[PDB]
Design a protein around this ligand. Structure first.
Ligand SMILES: [Mg+2]
Ligand SMILES: [Mg+2]
Ligand SMILES: [Mg+2]
Ligand SMILES: [Mg+2]
Ligand SMILES: [Mg+2]
Ligand SMILES: [Mg+2]
Ligand SMILES: [Mg+2]
Ligand SMILES: [Mg+2]
Ligand SMILES: [Mg+2]
Ligand SMILES: [Mg+2]
Ligand SMILES: [Mg+2]
Ligand SMILES: [Mg+2]
Ligand SMILES: [Mg+2]
Ligand SMILES: [Mg+2]
Ligand SMILES: [Mg+2]
Ligand SMILES: [Mg+2]
Ligand SMILES: [Mg+2]
Ligand SMILES: [Mg+2]
Ligand SMILES: [Mg+2]
Ligand SMILES: [Mg+2]
Ligand SMILES: [Mg+2]
Ligand SMILES: [Mg+2]
Ligand SMILES: [Mg+2]
Ligand SMILES: [Mg+2]
Ligand SMILES: [Mg+2]
Ligand SMILES: [Mg+2]
Ligand SMILES: [Mg+2]
Ligand SMILES: [Mg+2]
Ligand SMILES: [Mg+2]
Ligand SMILES: [Mg+2]
Ligand SMILES: [Mg+2]
Ligand SMILES: [Mg+2]
Ligand SMILES: [Mg+2]
Ligand SMILES: [Mg+2]
Ligand SMILES: [Mg+2]
Ligand SMILES: [Mg+2]
Ligand SMILES: [Mg+2]
Ligand SMILES: [Mg+2]
Ligand SMILES: [Mg+2]
Ligand SMILES: [Mg+2]
Ligand SMILES: [Mg+2]
Ligand SMILES: [Mg+2]
Ligand SMILES: [Mg+2]
Lengths: 110, 44, 117, 55, 119
RNA sequence: GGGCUCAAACCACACACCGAAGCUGCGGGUGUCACGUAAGUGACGCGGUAGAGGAGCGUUCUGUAAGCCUGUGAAGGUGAGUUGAGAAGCUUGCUGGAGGUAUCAGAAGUGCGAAUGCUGACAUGAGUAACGACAAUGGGUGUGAAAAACACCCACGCCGAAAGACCAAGGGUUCCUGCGCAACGUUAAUCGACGCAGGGUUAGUCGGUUCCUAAGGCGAGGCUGAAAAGCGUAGUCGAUG
RNA sequence: ACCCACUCCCGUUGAAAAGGUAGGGGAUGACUUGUGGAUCGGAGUGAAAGGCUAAUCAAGCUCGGAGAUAGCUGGUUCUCC
RNA sequence: GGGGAGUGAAAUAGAACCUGAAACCGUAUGCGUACAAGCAGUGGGAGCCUACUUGUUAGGUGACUGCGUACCUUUUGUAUA
RNA sequence: GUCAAGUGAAGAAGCGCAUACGGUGGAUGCCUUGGCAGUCAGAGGCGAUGAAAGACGUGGUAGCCUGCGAAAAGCUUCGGG
């Protein structure tokens, strides 16, 4: 079976979060968890929570074993942006986009 | 840099307040115009 | 009275983009870029219906030249011989013989050689 | 100085072909079986067998 | 270039650098185990280890030399009453730099600095 | 261009061949004339801007229509197939969940890629520049999911005719306490001039009000002026005194 | 101090729609400054630069005449013959 | 913020909630792509992959190769730099 | 078997096209709470018996709108129900 966890509106850019997602794609969950625990990226703290929530769904709703699970699918989708104004030097107003993303991790034994 | 708005509520009242407008006929016209448009604030 | 253009405009734009399938970048995604590419591809396609007939004839003539020179004749001498002896086999069929039916092509070349002299 | 032409999505992603993150060097303690950075004190507080920070 | 040069700038003036490493060495002598950045810990060796070497010979002039370089009465007392006698037979290497992970706020490489005999 | 010299140069002659959307062949469409009171045959045509002429497609609404289709699935959306010379039409899978409209007429807010067009969304630059005085930090402890930034302690540094303490103006609850961190804070935040709730401002003497006037305002009558009004007397306001 | 603004450099998508650092001038006077008040659109005010009159000045701003006018520039949307 | 459970005719109707287009951004699969020069197509065309109809087939890709300097406007004339 | 010569797949950091599934966004369709224009009537004024327009209050519980006015989402009475 395949179980997923999703974090919607993760306050980080999809471009930034996809660097971490590319590291754990296709890995066994135990290895992916150790990679995320020692990564210097902010997306790894967020990604690790989604990954271990997917592992918990696989162990409660489906009754699996962490040692049998591997990261089958992980993708980051762009979420809602937040629009902000930053003043510039001569009365110029610049629009700031505060990006968010949707992080979906799917674990599977298969 | 000193800017154009140097607030003084006394000066503001004496130049743009309700009694300053009611004192003249063109001031009463402003209140008629702003009542006809429905302004929530009438004077300052 | 008031006519919205949304449904009709979407149908128009989708027909163009469907024709721009397989094109690179904006040429398959962006309407006002895809529109130019679909028109230009149409100009090319019209012009290349003419060019295809030229290209294939040049290919037949080159293969007939190669096949006839293997038989002791140049292309120009073989065509003149195929007119002296009234042979009306065209170059598309002649180029197919020179590749696939070499004994048949040799017989025709000998018939042209005899006609010349 | 600015682009005369918008950069294509292929060209944008080609520059990013060097952006992939590397993995750290991970080691396992033998006194505890715990994963830690190589040459670093473990998150529990062990380095080469002995406890050093003592929490 | 910096060919064969010693020392770390640490984005500080030399006055602030001198003041900070004297503060750090004093803190290390009081607590015997501190956490700081790995670059600061590696440059703290060259400041705090000559102070323990000096403290091995207890004299008025050595104690005054210690106070000029620490400006801390407690640090001077600890160096000559405890640390100078503790490391009498140790030929240098009174500090231990152990790498911990990274700081949460800025991902700065961290290190533990402990006195060798007991932290 | 490669290369070329009894030429792959030049002069003359000859016989071949290549070569266009020209001509011919084969199939199709269309225009105009003529014969046809017919289906159709015949001949000659059929590049085209400005521009003239002709013939149509499609969209919204009205009538036809209290009809017809439609929850056994409308409009819309998204694929596939198919038909026509074209605008386009038709059939169908999926999505959708309640409307649609044959035919022939009638009316138009009737067709968009351009107007440095208008509105919204989203790209590229680019994870780049920057993170706002170069007075400056170090450590320990706590709390906390998490601490470089919060609190405390020990040090260090900075201002000190201010970067300290006030009065006025201006602002208006920002003040204090409990809870809290989404957003706001150019990072994080447990912290905050941020969110929720509660609390907090006590006067005969401080400052107003009240009394008095300055400049100046308004100004009964009045004088002047097409009107609106202007000026001004008696007065009455007006502090910065 | 305060008022000013002569030089250089920086800054020029600035910390800043006119600043900063270092130097500079006046500093009991035709001085600087607070509060309140008067004068304004062919009008005011001007130790006079066409300066200033709310980041707007060889005639402010705002609304109206008003969809001024534009022999000029741009644009003008389905199909076929 | 999700994964189940449940409600509901329907939850990819879950409260930023009918439908849910495009730009734009991803993940998966197939083919192509690191000796190769340009409006990126078009004509020819190998191979590979998929599906049945099992090769005179459909779909996807497309090595290699001929030809080929966007569009609008304005102009005597525009790839026009 | 050795050597030589010839030939040569597969191995993609990334990228392209297609397809499938998503995301973002909020078009389209359908809908209406609201408008626009008429036709037929009514009324053509309100105000010192204080108007138009407001401020502040008024409720068990915070705010805002509506109503009302210290008799304050209201009091008396007459009808309808
Ligand atoms: Mg050295
Ligand atoms: Mg630095
Ligand atoms: Mg000094
Ligand atoms: Mg010929
Ligand atoms: Mg021809
Ligand atoms: Mg012809
Ligand atoms: Mg014919
Ligand atoms: Mg012709
Ligand atoms: Mg014509
Ligand atoms: Mg409709
Ligand atoms: Mg458009
Ligand atoms: Mg056009
Ligand atoms: Mg750059
Ligand atoms: Mg750089
Ligand atoms: Mg930088
Ligand atoms: Mg700062
Ligand atoms: Mg957090
Ligand atoms: Mg102060
Ligand atoms: Mg406070
Ligand atoms: Mg924050
Ligand atoms: Mg608060
Ligand atoms: Mg008067
Ligand atoms: Mg009078
Ligand atoms: Mg008085
Ligand atoms: Mg006073
Ligand atoms: Mg002087
Ligand atoms: Mg002059
Ligand atoms: Mg000005
Ligand atoms: Mg004028
Ligand atoms: Mg007029
Ligand atoms: Mg005009
Ligand atoms: Mg059920
Ligand atoms: Mg519905
Ligand atoms: Mg929806
Ligand atoms: Mg190659
Ligand atoms: Mg190239
Ligand atoms: Mg082909
Ligand atoms: Mg070419
Ligand atoms: Mg010209
Ligand atoms: Mg040309
Ligand atoms: Mg151009
Ligand atoms: Mg160019
Ligand atoms: Mg890759």
């Amino acid at each position: 079976m395949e179980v997923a966890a999703k974090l919607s509106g993760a306050r980080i850019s999809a471009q930034k979060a996809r660097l971490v997602a590319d590291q754990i794609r296709g890995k066994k969950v135990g290895e992916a968890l150790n990679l995320l625990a020692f990564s210097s990226k902010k997306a790894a703290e967020i990604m690790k929570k989604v990954l271990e929530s997917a592992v918990a769904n696989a162990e409660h709703n489906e009754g699996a074993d962490v040692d049998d699970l591997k990261v089958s699918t992980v993708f980051v989708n762009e979420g809602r942006s937040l629009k902000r104004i930053m003043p510039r030097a001569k009365g110029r107003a610049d629009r700031i986009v505060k990006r968010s993303c949707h992080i979906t991790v799917k674990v599977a034994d298969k | 840099m000193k800017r154009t708005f140097q607030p003084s509520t006394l000066k503001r009242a004496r130049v743009h307040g309700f009694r300053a407008r009611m004192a003249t006929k063109n001031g009463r016209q402003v209140l008629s115009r702003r009542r006809a448009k429905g302004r929530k604030r009438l004077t300052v | 009275a008031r006519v919205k253009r949304g449904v009709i405009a979407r149908r128009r734009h989708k027909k163009i983009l469907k024709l721009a399938k397989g094109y690179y970048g904006a040429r398959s995604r962006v309407f006002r870029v895809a529109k130019q590419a679909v028109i230009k591809a149409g100009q090319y396609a019209y012009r290349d219906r003419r060019q295809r007939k030229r290209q294939f004839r040049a290919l037949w003539i080159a293969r007939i030249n190669a096949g006839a020179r293997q038989n002791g004749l140049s292309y120009s001498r073989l065509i003149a011989g195929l007119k002296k002896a009234a042979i009306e086999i065209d170059r598309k069929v002649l180029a197919d013989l020179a590749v696939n039916e070499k004994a048949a092509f040799t017989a025709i070349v000998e018939k042209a050689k005899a006609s010349l002299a | 100085a600015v682009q005369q032409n918008k950069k294509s999505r292929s060209a944008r992603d080609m520059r990013r072909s060097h952006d992939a993150l590397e993995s750290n060097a991970l080691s396992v303690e033998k006194s505890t079986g715990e994963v830690h950075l190589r040459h670093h004190v473990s998150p529990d507080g062990f380095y080469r067998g002995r406890k050093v920070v003592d929490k | 270039m910096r060919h064969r040069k010693s020392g770390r700038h640490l984005s500080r003036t030399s006055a602030h650098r001198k003041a900070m490493f004297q503060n750090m060495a004093v803190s290390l002598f009081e607590h015997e185990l501190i956490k700081t950045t790995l670059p600061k810990a590696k440059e703290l060796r060259r400041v705090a280890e000559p102070l323990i070497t000096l403290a091995k010979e207890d004299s008025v002039a050595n104690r005054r030399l210690a106070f000029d370089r620490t400006r801390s009465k407690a640090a001077v007392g600890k160096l000559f009453n405890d640390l100078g006698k503790r490391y009498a037979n140790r030929p240098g290497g009174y500090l231990r730099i152990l790498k911990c992970g990274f700081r949460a706020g800025d991902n700065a490489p961290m290190a533990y600095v402990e006195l060798v005999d007991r932290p």
